Design a protein around this ligand. Sequence first.
Ligand SMILES: [Cl-]
Ligand SMILES: [Cl-]
Ligand SMILES: [Cl-]
Ligand SMILES: [Cl-]
Ligand SMILES: [Cl-]
Ligand SMILES: [Cl-]
Ligand SMILES: [Cl-]
Ligand SMILES: [Cl-]
Ligand SMILES: [Cl-]
Lengths: 239, 240, 234
Amino acid sequence: PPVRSAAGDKEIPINGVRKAIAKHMSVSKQEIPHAWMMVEVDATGLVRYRNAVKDSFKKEEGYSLTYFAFFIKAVAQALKEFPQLNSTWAGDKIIEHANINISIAIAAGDLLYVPVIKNADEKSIKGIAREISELAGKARNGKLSQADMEGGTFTVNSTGSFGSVQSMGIINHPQAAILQVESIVKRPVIIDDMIAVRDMVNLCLSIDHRILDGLLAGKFLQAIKANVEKISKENTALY
Amino acid sequence: TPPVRSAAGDKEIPINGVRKAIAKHMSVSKQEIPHAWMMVEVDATGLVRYRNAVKDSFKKEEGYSLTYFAFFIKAVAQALKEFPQLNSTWAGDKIIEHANINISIAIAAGDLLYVPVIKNADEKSIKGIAREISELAGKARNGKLSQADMEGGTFTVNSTGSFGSVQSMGIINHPQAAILQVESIVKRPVIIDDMIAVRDMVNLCLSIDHRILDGLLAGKFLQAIKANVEKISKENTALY
Amino acid sequence: AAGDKEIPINGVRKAIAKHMSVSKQEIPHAWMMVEVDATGLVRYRNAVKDSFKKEEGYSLTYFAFFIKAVAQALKEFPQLNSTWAGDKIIEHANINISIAIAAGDLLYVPVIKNADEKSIKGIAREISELAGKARNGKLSQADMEGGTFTVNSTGSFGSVQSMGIINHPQAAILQVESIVKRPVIIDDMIAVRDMVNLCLSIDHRILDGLLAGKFLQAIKANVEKISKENTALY
Ligand SMILES: [Cl-]
Ligand SMILES: [Cl-]
Ligand SMILES: [Cl-]
Ligand SMILES: [Cl-]
Ligand SMILES: [Cl-]
Ligand SMILES: [Cl-]
Ligand SMILES: [Cl-]
Ligand SMILES: [Cl-]
Ligand SMILES: [Cl-]
């Protein structure tokens, strides 16, 4: 199988970091039998809330509040209810982690960084938003420590930042699952036999099928769905 | 070789031989089979309306309930008779197409996952299929599920719509050739003859062994199931 | 195996199957999808198709426009037009698009060479020629070689969404699904549009979602700008 089709083909050498990311992706796919599941979510309440408070948030705190912070929080709370999803396959046993440490993807133009928000369940939305802008700030300056990259127990990727509608991600070995949060799209939907216009978002979950099946994955996805759909001005506190 | 623990208070749950077998099966299937995936949208409005018209008097007479799933199993079984290439097994030297249409169905209880088989499902009526569903699901909760029920499967159908899923990619039950996930039935605005209609739409999601099958056969097969489901009404469909 | 049927696997059919297996083992696949408004494309193709077939002798399909849109986007994103080679990534100078033209029993994947330098007419011509060569068993070895990206017309089988296996050692495969009329929202109004999903599988050793997304956005913008006055066939 030839790897070249012209004399003018460009060869790009691969540094130690990039090669390690690639080896990680290969190991993950080889070791984990992935299955995938998708759920539609009404994010209108979240959109309305975020846009109501975003401007005064940036005035008061100095960093912006993204939709992502709310999604991290909703995932964190659902993981408290479902520890089987916060787990690791280890041959003859499944290890359920006591910490909810959410790996988030923040990619550069060249490569992909996956820092970890430790104990995400114990942080507020403001706290998560602070940490996101800090980690993105450190990824842009190349000042990202190994302590920032370690101890992740679950991964959430904001693929909607890249305009995707549906995606299937590779699980961050040795974790059990990865959730992709897709684009928020205005759609005509049906509510009580009427046609409404709502801000819909797909949640796309890849699972380690040795650990989990559709039943548990579905119950988990429903829990995140319910957490997102309950977001309004009265029900959700930023701190 | 990476760390598997992140706290002293991490809980270790031992894996029994049954769950360990299921897990080894999932790994073998993924290693051995190059999966590719296809999806079609299906108007299940006729099926919903017909089922809801007859479900009440069915449970009164038969003693067991008629679900949406029974209709799908019947629609799949007929389409497997149309396309035996889907009802097959890779054997390196040759491909074996099976004459018997035996459909493995996924029934999960909590964490553990069972796959009992409905033998010769093309020859059974919707009534007969419904009977065997309630029988096998009854024995799955009781744990009185025999080995003979687990064996002989040539195709797998999973009712992922029970878990509220809208789209799914399943792992093929090796050494079978394909698996179908029947998703949730969802009311959707839809275009019929340039008009906006409210229909009961369902996704059918198929994983294929790409050593055996391509998009052409898979597309034809999915179209056959689609046509089988979309023709369901009071006049076209007999339960017995 | 009582009334079972046995179909033997010849050397060609076995080679395809081995190639599928190797690809899935060597390449860690990830997948991404965007929806695109193909109304402008549909309207333009239908307005011009009949006078095209009369003048040229071969038909103009939707697929020719999609090849062109992908090829133009690959000029901006050479990282997708690439190959994993151990310690190096090789970006290819030629945009040679492998297309699936399955005729009858099995699957044929010939290659439209330098597709970025051909017109929509030229691409339509080449699809016709390659389909004719596949039907007549006349595909040369040169026709099968040199592919740098693959596009599959899964819409022809009525697929709405799809995940394809990458043609190793390429970096990515794009599946173009069915064009379906859909109720859609445009400036808070309900419109009816011709929507098509573009489904992309990538080698995650080479590419991530950020690059894949930008690429899909470029194809989206290329397709959605096709109109009655914008694009020329020649
Ligand atoms: Cl996998
Ligand atoms: Cl991805
Ligand atoms: Cl499952
Ligand atoms: Cl696979
Ligand atoms: Cl599944
Ligand atoms: Cl194909
Ligand atoms: Cl893969
Ligand atoms: Cl496919
Ligand atoms: Cl990514």
